[PDB]
Amino acid sequence: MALNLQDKQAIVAEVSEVAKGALSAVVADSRGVTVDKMTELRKAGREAGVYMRVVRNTLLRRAVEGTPFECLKDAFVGPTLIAYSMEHPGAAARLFKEFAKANAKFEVKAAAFEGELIPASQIDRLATLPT
Amino acid sequence: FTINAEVRKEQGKGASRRLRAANKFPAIIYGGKEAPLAIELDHDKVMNMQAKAEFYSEVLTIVVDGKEIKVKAQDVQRHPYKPKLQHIDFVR
Amino acid sequence: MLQPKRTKFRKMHKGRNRGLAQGTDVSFGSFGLKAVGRGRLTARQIEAARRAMTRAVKRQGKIWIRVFPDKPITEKPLAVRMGKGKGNVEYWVALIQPGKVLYEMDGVPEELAREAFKLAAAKLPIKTTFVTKTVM
Amino acid sequence: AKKVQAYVKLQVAAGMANPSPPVGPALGQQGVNIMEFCKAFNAKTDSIEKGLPIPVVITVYADRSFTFVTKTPPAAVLLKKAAGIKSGSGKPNKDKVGKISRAQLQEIAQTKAADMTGADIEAMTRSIEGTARSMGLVVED
Amino acid sequence: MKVRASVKKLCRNCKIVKRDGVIRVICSAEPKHKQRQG
RNA sequence: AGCCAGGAUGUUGGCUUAGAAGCAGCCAUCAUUUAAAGAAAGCGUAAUAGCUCACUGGUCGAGUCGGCCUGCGCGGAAGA
Ligand SMILES: [Mg+2]
Ligand SMILES: [Mg+2]
Ligand SMILES: [Mg+2]
Ligand SMILES: [Mg+2]
Ligand SMILES: [Mg+2]
Ligand SMILES: [Mg+2]
Ligand SMILES: [Mg+2]
Ligand SMILES: [Mg+2]
Ligand SMILES: [Mg+2]
Ligand SMILES: [Mg+2]
Ligand SMILES: [Mg+2]
Ligand SMILES: [Mg+2]
Ligand SMILES: [Mg+2]
């Protein structure tokens, strides 16, 4: 895996997205399908474009190095697979529920849909969002 | 592209082979109105140096007795079959 | 099977294959098969090693044969006593000293070159090695 | 929505009703009959076009018949009448077979958007353009 | 097995092992590739 | 290197309409959704399906696949 600079670019890119973001959502394919790939991510295309970097790399010190600088509560989320689905347009968008809705639609499991950070909450399926 | 190199004192068949059997090899620097200078230098460096294409084109600064002499590699003697150098002619 | 097209003399002295080779640098192609060992290559071995290369790389690429026989080897028949003349010329050989580039190749990948030269090297008596064209 | 029970995508030209040499045993491998791919198969086919291959989902259940929703015809079968040359592919890099531009394939791209996956039209445009790239038709951009 | 003087890794699952001084090549997939010596 | 994971909707793609369907042969060798995916390195099919690997994720978490230059060894190595 390429140099400390190349690696630094990846996280320093991820930290800048948290500065211009708000809501996030976990997703753990622990027996998904690529037929699912372009539902949870295809959604993000249907939002607008490529910018929505789901950056699946919550490793104990990888995205948790960027944690100290931005949102300290996500350190405990580390254990077991998580994807930091950083959003951009629309404060608290519909991208949170669709991971939980896709889970039923042929994806086996999805991290027990625990969630990330808006009111600093845990595992809660929440339809109450701005629409 | 900077190499430390010693001045030769013994020179001929006997010296050169003794030298090449000690991880070094004989080279020579010449050019301009000045006299030619025989130069003993390390093998394992210059072997790794020549892999780059810049070596046989760009200017090299050979360090001898403190003094840094600017040169280009004009001619070179490969060992017949083994991948290793015998001798280098440095033009100034 | 390679052979001189007419010569001055039919039969030649045995001689002594000594010293180092002269065709040492890879001149024409990008890659080459250099002779590490000493020995002699027959006309048959050269053709056999050429066919093994040519078939491995397929129609594509270009191959040179830097060596050529031009030394006739005599052999006395079976159940024949010594003397009563020099024997009859049976086969033609190129003397190979160490350092000699045998074959040269161009217009192929480095990965697929090395495997082509192994198949040739397996047909030759002499111990050989791969060499690349270095710029000066 | 249910998981993998017994669904497979497989049938030649949709005009060819009841294929025995082309497919035969495969569609009649399970409990579903050979007659099902003839009467019900040409119901949806006759709306769009015949002499055209088109796929369909074969989610077999223990009842008798199966539920299904048809999708879309694939890339290069559409790039016959659209492309020009029947022989799609031959020796492209060594010998370029044909060529197609962006204007046609971009226009052809969006007509399958009911089935196709993507963000914008320009997103799937370079995909369904690219479907030409790979027929020896180095895209005339 | 084969007892050739030049044993080598024929397929991917073939594996070289030195048992009691002799070099052997043991395989999971094809028992044909099982070969000793050399 | 290990471990529950992912590793596509059209591609039955044209082709010699008997099929080549990611993988007989042709060549191209798409680009989207994006953590990632070659329109594919191998297995398996009349061809599909299917199972692996490339890659990408999360765990345990530290040194590690490979090539020349060589010093000594090993097999190759059976006779009255
Ligand atoms: Mg002298
Ligand atoms: Mg003198
Ligand atoms: Mg002497
Ligand atoms: Mg001058
Ligand atoms: Mg003599
Ligand atoms: Mg001579
Ligand atoms: Mg000469
Ligand atoms: Mg007698
Ligand atoms: Mg024993
Ligand atoms: Mg013993
Ligand atoms: Mg024996
Ligand atoms: Mg015995
Ligand atoms: Mg005896």
CSV table of C-alpha atoms (C1' of nucleotides) in Angstrom, one decimal, chain D residues 9-11 53-55 71-74 76-77 80 86 89-94 115 119 123 126-127 130-131 133-135, chain F residues 8-21 25-34 39 46-50:
chain,number,residue,atom,x,y,z
D,9,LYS,CA,-31.5,-15.6,-16.9
D,10,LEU,CA,-31.5,-17.7,-20.1
D,11,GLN,CA,-33.3,-17.6,-23.5
D,53,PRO,CA,-33.3,-11.4,-27.8
D,54,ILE,CA,-34.8,-10.2,-24.4
D,55,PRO,CA,-34.3,-11.6,-20.8
D,71,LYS,CA,-35.8,-6.2,-18.2
D,72,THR,CA,-34.1,-5.0,-21.4
D,73,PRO,CA,-32.2,-6.3,-24.5
D,74,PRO,CA,-28.3,-6.4,-24.1
D,76,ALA,CA,-24.4,-5.4,-28.9
D,77,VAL,CA,-27.5,-7.2,-30.2
D,80,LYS,CA,-26.3,-4.6,-35.1
D,86,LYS,CA,-23.2,-7.8,-38.4
D,89,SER,CA,-15.8,-8.3,-33.3
D,90,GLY,CA,-12.7,-9.7,-35.0
D,91,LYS,CA,-9.2,-8.0,-34.6
D,92,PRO,CA,-9.8,-4.4,-33.2
D,93,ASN,CA,-6.3,-3.5,-31.8
D,94,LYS,CA,-4.4,-5.2,-34.6
D,115,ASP,CA,-33.6,-1.1,-16.4
D,119,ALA,CA,-26.8,8.9,-11.5
D,123,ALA,CA,-23.1,8.7,-16.4
D,126,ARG,CA,-20.2,6.7,-21.5
D,127,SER,CA,-21.2,3.2,-20.3
D,130,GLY,CA,-18.4,2.1,-24.0
D,131,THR,CA,-20.4,-1.0,-25.0
D,133,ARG,CA,-15.7,0.6,-27.5
D,134,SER,CA,-15.6,-3.1,-27.0
D,135,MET,CA,-16.7,-4.3,-30.5
F,8,A,C1',-23.5,-6.5,-10.6
F,9,U,C1',-29.0,-5.0,-13.7
F,10,G,C1',-29.1,-5.4,-19.2
F,11,U,C1',-23.7,-9.3,-21.6
F,12,U,C1',-29.0,-15.3,-24.5
F,13,G,C1',-24.1,-8.9,-26.8
F,14,G,C1',-23.0,-9.0,-32.1
F,15,C,C1',-20.2,-13.3,-34.2
F,16,U,C1',-20.4,-18.7,-39.3
F,17,U,C1',-28.3,-17.4,-36.0
F,18,A,C1',-26.4,-25.1,-33.7
F,19,G,C1',-24.1,-22.4,-29.1
F,20,A,C1',-20.5,-19.9,-27.1
F,21,A,C1',-23.6,-16.4,-21.9
F,25,G,C1',-11.6,-19.0,-31.0
F,26,C,C1',-12.3,-13.8,-32.5
F,27,C,C1',-10.3,-8.9,-30.8
F,28,A,C1',-12.4,-4.7,-28.0
F,29,U,C1',-10.9,-5.2,-23.1
F,30,C,C1',-17.1,-0.5,-21.3
F,31,A,C1',-18.3,3.2,-18.1
F,32,U,C1',-21.5,4.0,-14.6
F,33,U,C1',-23.1,3.1,-8.7
F,34,U,C1',-18.9,3.6,-5.7
F,39,A,C1',-16.9,-7.0,-18.9
F,46,A,C1',-23.7,-28.7,-24.7
F,47,A,C1',-23.7,-23.3,-23.2
F,48,U,C1',-25.8,-21.3,-18.4
F,49,A,C1',-26.0,-21.7,-13.4
F,50,G,C1',-22.4,-22.1,-9.6
